[PDB]
């Protein structure tokens, strides 16, 4: 009765190509053009953040083969910086970053799925909120019922989005078959273009969170990252090239959802395929996220930080049912929220903050415990290059949003009351302890769940 | 900390809990299908776009 290893190479590849590719490539590629004001420059801006993300991902193949604890960067932080730094990450992951990104991506599924029923005008808001919740519930039910099912669904929609991107790419090639201008030289333009590109590729670090369910980590994990990010970079460059076969610079910058505007121009009749497959592209991403989310919080309760109810696996199904319930509930609560998209904007840097701290931690680990096995070692300087480049592309985020990161840095302090109350207190209030126990056994009986055989 | 693997199964196998868990799974699926039918209601009842 323990989480069984089930993730083959293909399912690891499906997870990481699944969660990277996103909506971004279909409905926000213009984020590069707005700052990189020439199409011949926009294609090299995508290649640059391609190779930058690759060297980042290699560093995570190192972390994930040097430390095999399967928390993702939460466990990587804890193994170097100890309890409280890792907790201040995990509290923000639980309360904000993992749920609000799930809810946003579910809503992007809802909108672009329903778009063909409302081609010219905004979709019914009251329906979109509901169809988001229908998706987040169903994929929680699947991942609660079976890991084999979860990974088969991820396989299916990781396929489905590449299938969509292939259609976009080949229509670009058809258009070329029929048959640097204006470039911004300025550092103050192109640096913000590059940063605006990394919001697309963000999602590569998500495979590290399932090192414990990976079948053969030392072989499969470094291979999955080598297999995926070149495929992604290639697909990004080719797909953005395909748009430049069809649309002008101005036309793209004023377009609402560029894959749909391209889709209309090429298909005409049946163009609704592209809205639908933009929907399916997101249907896959929510699954990949819920899976990953549940395993983060499951390591959170293993390390004794979160309440031990979340460690309790289903004994016949081998799925972390309480963690998936927690993941789902915290996601659905974002369905209340007002004017939501810029609330997340002040945490957009925080992903990079954690990656930076983790690779700095890997470099400290390379001298504090030099004797560890390390089946993968990269060049001494490659992490240092990547840290320096990451710190530069952290620094711009504060400059871009200084009062909002004033809220961002305020909200991480939420963890300090929680840490002293939950992690650290030495269990003084006996009348509350017997209630915690009572609630815990109730949940165990009610869900039929038990601790991990370890 | 919580209740050990074997001790839980001495209680949670009782017909009261089994009936309860059966009812919960079933009413969860009914509730979700209720959302699904609700969504179709909203979609059909809402006005279509002004055409070009």
Using an 8 Å CB-CB cutoff, list chain B residues near A310.
none
300-339 in chain A: CB under 8 A from chain B = 308-309, 311-312, 315
Helices (H), A67-216: 73-81, 83-92, 98-114, 125-145, 147-178, 187-201
Q: Are the Cβ atoms of A445 and B48 closer than 8 angstroms?
A: no
CA-closest candidate to residue A4, choices A140, A138, A146: A146
Only one residue has tokens 């909203």, namely B42
Q: Are A30 and A252 in contact (CB under 8 A)?
A: yes
* Sign, CA torsion A112/A105/A70/A306: negative
Q: Are the Cβ atoms of A133 and B35 closer than 8 angstroms?
A: yes
Using an 8 Å CB-CB cutoff, list chain A residues near B48.
117-118
Q: Are the Cβ atoms of B32 and A137 closer than 8 angstroms?
A: yes
Say what angle helices A217-244 and A258-267 make with each other, to 10 degrees: 60
CA-closest candidate to residue A155, choices A251, A287, A293: A287
Nearest chain B Cα distance for residue A61, angstroms: 34
Option in A124, A308, A448 nearest B12 (CB): A448
* Torsion angles phi and psi, residue A214, rounded to 5: -50, 135
Q: Are A45 and A193 in contact (CB under 8 A)?
A: yes
Task: Please work out, in degrees rounded to the nearest 5, the angle formed at the alpha carbon of residue A440 by the alpha carbons of A437 and A445.
Answer: 125
Rounded Cα distance between A209 and A72, Å, is 4
* Sign, CA torsion A184/A185/A188/A192: positive
Q: Which residues are paired to A313 by β-bridges?
A: A450
Rounded Cα distance between A238 and A160, Å, is 17
Q: Are the Cβ atoms of A440 and B3 closer than 8 angstroms?
A: yes
Q: Closest-CA residue in chain B for A453?
A: B5
Nearest chain B Cα distance for residue A373, angstroms: 34
Nearest chain B Cα distance for residue A179, angstroms: 30
**How many CB atoms are closer than 10 A to CB A331?**
27
Determined by which method?
cryo-EM
Instruction: Please report, to the nearest 10 degrees, the dihedral formed by the alpha carbons of residues A129, A406, A363, A75 taken in order.
Output: -40
Option in A134, A448, A453 nearest B32 (CB): A134
């Amino acid at each position: 009765v323990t989480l069984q290893r089930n993730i083959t190479l293909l399912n690891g590849v499906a997870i990481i190509v699944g969660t990277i590719i996103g909506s971004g490539i279909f409905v926000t590629p213009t984020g590069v053009l707005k700052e990189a004001g020439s199409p011949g420059l926009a294609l090299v801006v995508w290649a640059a953040c391609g190779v930058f993300s690759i060297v980042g991902a290699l560093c995570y193949a190192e972390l994930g083969t040097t430390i095999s604890k399967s928390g993702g960067d939460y466990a990587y932080m804890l193994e170097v910086y100890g309890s409280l730094p890792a907790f201040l990450k995990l509290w923000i992951e639980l309360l904000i970053i993992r749920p609000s990104s799930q809810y946003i991506v579910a809503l992007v599924f809802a909108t672009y799925l329903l778009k063909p029923l409302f081609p010219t005008c905004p979709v019914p808001e009251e329906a979109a909120k509901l169809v988001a919740c229908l998706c987040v519930l169903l994929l929680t039910a699947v991942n609660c019922y079976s890991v084999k099912a979860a990974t088969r669904v991820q396989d299916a929609f990781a396929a489905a989005k590449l299938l969509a991107l292939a259609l976009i790419i080949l229509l670009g090639f058809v258009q070329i078959g029929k048959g640097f201008e204006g470039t911004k030289l300025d550092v103050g333009n192109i640096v913000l273009a590059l940063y605006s590109g990394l919001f697309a590729y963000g999602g590569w670090n998500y495979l590290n969170f399932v090192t414990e369910e990976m079948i053969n980590p030392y072989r499969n994990l470094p291979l999955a990252i080598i297999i995926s990010l070149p495929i992604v970079t290639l697909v990004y460059v080719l797909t953005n090239l395909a748009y430049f076969t069809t649309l002008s610079t101005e036309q793209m910058l004023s377009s609402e959802a560029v894959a749909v505007d391209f889709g209309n121009y090429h298909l005409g009749v049946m163009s609704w395929i592209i809205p639908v497959f933009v929907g399916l592209s997101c249907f896959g991403s929510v699954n990949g996220s819920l899976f990953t989310s549940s395993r983060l919080f499951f390591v959170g309760s293993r390390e004794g930080h979160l309440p031990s109810i979340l460690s309790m696996i289903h004994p016949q199904l081998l799925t972390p049912v309480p963690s998936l319930v927690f993941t789902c509930v915290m996601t659905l609560l974002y369905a209340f929220s007002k004017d939501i998209f810029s609330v997340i904007n002040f945490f957009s840097f925080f992903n990079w903050l954690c990656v930076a701290l983790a690779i700095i931690g890997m470099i400290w680990l390379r001298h504090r415990k030099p004797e560890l096995e390390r089946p993968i070692k990269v060049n001494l300087a490659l992490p240092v290059f990547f840290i320096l480049a990451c710190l530069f592309l952290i620094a711009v985020s504060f400059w871009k949003t200084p009062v909002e990161c004033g809220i961002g840095f305020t909200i991480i302090l939420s963890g300090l009351p929680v840490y002293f109350f939950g992690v650290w207190w030495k269990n003084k209030p006996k009348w509350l302890l017997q209630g915690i126990f009572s609630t815990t056994v109730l949940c165990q009986k009610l869900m039929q769940v038990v601790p991990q055989e370890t | 900390t919580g209740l050990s693997k074997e001790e839980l199964l001495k209680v949670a196998g009782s017909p009261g809990w089994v009936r309860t868990r059966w009812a919960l799974l079933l009413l969860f699926w009914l509730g979700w299908l209720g959302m699904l039918a609700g969504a179709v209601v909203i979609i059909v009842r809402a006005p279509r776009c002004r055409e070009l």
